[PDB]
Amino acid sequence: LVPRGSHMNTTVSCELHLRLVVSSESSLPVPAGLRYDTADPYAVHATFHTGAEETVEWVFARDLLAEGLHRPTGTGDVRVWPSRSHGQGVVCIALSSPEGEALLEAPARALESFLKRTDAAVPPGTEH
């Protein structure tokens, strides 16, 4: 007989509503889920409910999202930058594929709250 070992897992999960920027005038509701798992401590998994059947899933560098609160960061597929809308701070996320480009606004307080919880689980600079 071989003794059994142990499995720990820490998951930080956030449910948000993002606004898809259609125009200066108009925007659409995009329910979003951010998932952080200490298993994969460099990544944040975002699932967007866009009206597509099977949903859209993106993986973000946690560090990219973290500095997106303070200054504009990101090239290729993802750009992130800070701004304000309807009298509250937001993070703007610009997603690019061959299909096209789409712009999302997230509540800043909520995004930075989620990242504080992942920092508690696994502080930046502590991936071992």
Add this chain to the structure above:
Amino acid sequence: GSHMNTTVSCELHLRLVVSSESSLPVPAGLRYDTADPYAVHATFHTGAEETVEWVFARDLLAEGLHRPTGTGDVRVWPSRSHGQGVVCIALSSPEGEALLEAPARALESFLKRTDAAVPPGTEHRHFD
């Protein structure tokens, strides 16, 4: 509107103490959820698809590592077996009593992860 949630999940193997000589394997899952920051949800696999679900005061389990204590249906105390620390957990149903040994390293590891998520004394901050 925001749903933030940190979940610490642990898979352990406990021994059900049937005699001084002999014990049985009990696969267990411990789940800590910041939604309910005072509790640990344990699922015990005692039989072929026969499951028990128990809710523990996290603080009761935490003290059970270093001294003997208890409240209501649960008594917890430290001991050693095959040269490793364990926690003995005595559960009382109305009909009768069952005694479990948990690996102390594993249990203490799980509780360190929940302490990271919600340090004891800061459980009130997750009251929605």
Add this chain to the structure above:
Amino acid sequence: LVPRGSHMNTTVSCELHLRLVVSSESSLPVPAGLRYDTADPYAVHATFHTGTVEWVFARDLLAEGLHRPTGTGDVRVWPSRSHGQGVVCIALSSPEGEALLEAPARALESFLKRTDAAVPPGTEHR
């Protein structure tokens, strides 16, 4: 509608035969599987067929176990030889007891070279 992203993953899988050391005289066959996934870049998932038991190893613990004795708490790993080939000895501890496994060194070292190709040690950020 939001543009779609990309999700790529590298998995290194190894099938090994370990000997469970019963005595100086006797040992038992333990089929084993090591899985490395870039999803979880610090770990090696070993499934041992006792007819299964699953353990998670610090890849770095296994890597250093090829050249010197390392590990405390649940797992100790160290180099040795058996039936005229190099091995890694793995000592697994629970409250149940302790069990000792011998793995082929060449095979273990080969598996780790493939995970180092996928994710060089210290390059888990990337």
Add this chain to the structure above:
Amino acid sequence: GSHMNTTVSCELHLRLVVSSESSLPVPAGLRYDTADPYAVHATFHTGAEETVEWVFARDLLAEGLHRPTGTGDVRVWPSRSHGQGVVCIALSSPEGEALLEAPARALESFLKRTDAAVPPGTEHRHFD
């Protein structure tokens, strides 16, 4: 002895080019396995749960990023759409031809991971 295997798997979204104007979303999976180090196995989701499976010489896909080339059933060439690089893949079967656009960034990322696993010119070492 041993059965050792490295698998690189990529989840991609391709556009089936039906007209100059219009295209359709085709979820795809690319799988590279060191068992078969010269090939890429692509699964295209065209239906509610109906699939097409194609095998590519990875070297054909790799060259298709930078210049137009082709062998047998497959022609591959570079282009751009909504300001991002793509690879056009023309699959010619007895039925007819389907034309696909793949994201170049994503395809080139996938091929870098297979080059890490098995650098081109070292494919003979994985012939068991």
